[PDB]
Structures are given as structure tokens and as C-alpha cells.
Symmetry: D2
């Protein structure tokens, strides 16, 4: 599982469930070509976005739809979304877990990168 997203809710103290996540790869012309999406599970996790073979070196964008999450809880948010943009696999294939810690006016994104 080369790419995993985990989302936590710092207001409720819970996994952030049903958060939509879209993944893009930067194209030759510098445009973003959306290619894996999903929604987080009851544990706040989204597994299964891509496979080893398809997840070649490149620049990737993970867009986490935080604004829809906070709207569905009735809480005003600041950001339109939380993006994470990174170059993948530059030194070989890696497994990436992106941990997003969400508050309405703040978030953090951390990568845990492990070698298979």
C-alpha cells in the first residue's frame, strides 16, 4: 500500500470520517491530472489509492476536502482544503502515510515514510 492518508479531528477527538481525498500527478505541461480519490473510513484512514506499479516517481498532490468536513459538522472553517504536494519515490519506492491533523482555523500535514 504505497500511499495512505490518515485524518484526525482536533475538535472532537476522533478520526475524521467520510473526508473526501483526491490525488493528482503533475503532468508534463505543469497541470495537475487528477487520477486516485476516496473517502476516509470509520478509523479516519484511506487505503487503496494506488498500487506499487502505478505509483512511479513524480510530483503528487493530495487534496483533502476539509471545508466539506467542517460544514457537515456545523463548524465554520478557514481553509478551502488542505493540500499536500510532494515528490514521491525520488530515492526508490517508499510507503507514504500522510497524517492530517485538522482544526477549523489550523492544520498540520506530516509524512511518515517507510522503506518497504
Amino acid at each position: 500500500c504505497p500511499l495512505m492518508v490518515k485524518v484526525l479531528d482536533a475538535v472532537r477527538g476522533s478520526p475524521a470520517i467520510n473526508v473526501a481525498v483526491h490525488v493528482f500527478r503533475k503532468a508534463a505541461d505543469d497541470t495537475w491530472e487528477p487520477f486516485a480519490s476516496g473517502k476516509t473510513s470509520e478509523s479516519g484512514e484511506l487505503h487503496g489509492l494506488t498500487t506499487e506499479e502505478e505509483f512511479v516517481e513524480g510530483i503528487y498532490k493530495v487534496e483533502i476536502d476539509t471545508k466539506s468536513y467542517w460544514k457537515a459538522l456545523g463548524i465554520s472553517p478557514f481553509h478551502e482544503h488542505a493540500e499536500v504536494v510532494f515528490t514521491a519515490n525520488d530515492s526508490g519506492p517508499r510507503r507514504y502515510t500522510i497524517v492530517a491533523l485538522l482544526s477549523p482555523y489550523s492544520y498540520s500535514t506530516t509524512a511518515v515514510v517507510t522503506n518497504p
Copy 2:
């Protein structure tokens, strides 16, 4: 006064100096128009990007060039950049401070929004 960016280095506990920041605004056609740019000072702050009259309602994107900051310190960080995307001034003029806390594999962004 209406938009200020503050960048801090969480490894050294210091302002992140000379960090490039580019601000864009979403046009009516949905493209990202360049809006303003600058670099952080010795205090890690970037003041003077815009004016109350030019900073009208809209969706703005702040991209902070965190990769070049780390690369100049010899580090190959995770994130290509830190980007903050938000609707501004939707209920009248506000002052926005965007705080970014940088680590090689993590970043934290917070908005402090005040009504002048």
C-alpha cells in the same frame, strides 16, 4: 495591514528567513491570477503584500516555498511547498495573519483573523 505571513523553523526554533511567498487570487474564469509576492524578513515575517482596497473578497492561495528553504540548509524535505487556500473578506474586511511552522517532514498552518 490586511495580509501578513509569518514563517517559523521548528527544528531550530527561529524565524525562517528569506522564504519566498507567492499569493494568487482565483479569477471569475477559475484560473489562479498572480496577486502579490515577497520574501520573509529577519523576523520570519512578510508585511506589505496588499492594501485594504486591493484585497477584495475572493479565494486566495498563499504558496510558501519551503523546499528551497530546506534545500539551502542541506535538507531534502517532504513537501514541495506549503500552500494555504482560503476565502477572504466574505463578511467584510478582516486582517489575516497566516502562520506556518516548518519541519522537514511536517508543516503546521494557522490563520489568525481579526476585525480591525
Copy 3:
């Protein structure tokens, strides 16, 4: 497993392995009585600190020895340790996961609290 600690390293992008963790319960006289300790595993996790029966309502302190972790990596740290102090089980027994995101001059502690 009523209490789990997960520690991440934002400088390397990895679980923080071999981090010492001590757990205390506040005594009747307001002193801290240390009672579960352990060290994080290769996944940055520490499971098995306490059991359902023993983890009664009370105020608990989790001390994470961040300073020793950063010293063992050769990196100067700011904090002596990261503490987390919380009242447990005030509305019934819960499972607590404490997520600590570590940088040398910054950290965050988040609780994910789930009902069994």
C-alpha cells in the same frame, strides 16, 4: 487496550522508535504516582500500558522523554519532555490514543478518544 501512545518524528519522517514513556496517576495528596512505562516500538507505538480494570477514572499524566530521543539522534532539543495531562473516563470508559508529533523546538499532542 485503553491507552495507546503513538509518536512521530517530523524531522526524519518516521515513527519515533525507542522513545521512553511514563504514565502517572494523580494521588489524593496531589502528587504524581508513577505506575505504566514502556518504550515505543518500531512503528512508534506503545500498547499495553494498562488494562480496563485498572484504568479507573482519575487524572493521568503521560510523560514522553523527547529530550533523550533527540539526543540519541544528535539533534539539539528545546523541551525536557512532552507531557500530556488529562482526566480519563469522566463519562464512562474510553479508549485513548495519544498522538505526539515531535520536532526539536515544537510538538503537538492530540487525543483520539473512541467509545469501546
Copy 4:
């Protein structure tokens, strides 16, 4: 100038006003001696705790009463308080800004340490 505490509310994107802060210093016998105290102003800042001459080398503890802040807003938060424990001035006098970013189930603390 030598110690300032800044507290921000990540739910509202605002300074956290009227937050009580107590500072202690570890004595030669290992007890925590009261050192100074104050409350955050309308800007979320607490200035004036100490002086360069009184703030000698030592281990200091800053406890921020985050629980009472949340309780006054109707919220039962996770943490009893946010406590920052650090050695100060070990290589000569420095200026310390302790930044705390608060959410009901998370807090982020960062030290910015400058040499005047």
C-alpha cells in the same frame, strides 16, 4: 523581554484571551518553585513575566490553564493544561517566545529562541 507567551485558539482563529499562565523554576532540591504568573491580554500575549537579571539559567515550567479557557466557552477539553518544560539560558541569555495553539483535543507548542 526575556520570556513571552502567546496563546492562539485554533477553532476560531483568534488570540486566546484571559488565559492564566503560571511559571515555575526547578530549585536545587528538585522542587518546582513558583516563579511568575499572569494572564494573556487581548492580543493572546503575556509580556512582563520576568527580567533578564532574574531569569537565570535553570529548568523552567510554563503551565497554561487551557481547561478553564475551554470550559468558559462551554467545552470539556481533553488536556487539563498545556505545560512547557525547558532548560533556559544554558549558553547565555536568550529571549524565549512560547507559542501555544489550542484546540479542544489537541495543542501545539513551539519555542522561538533569539539571541538579543
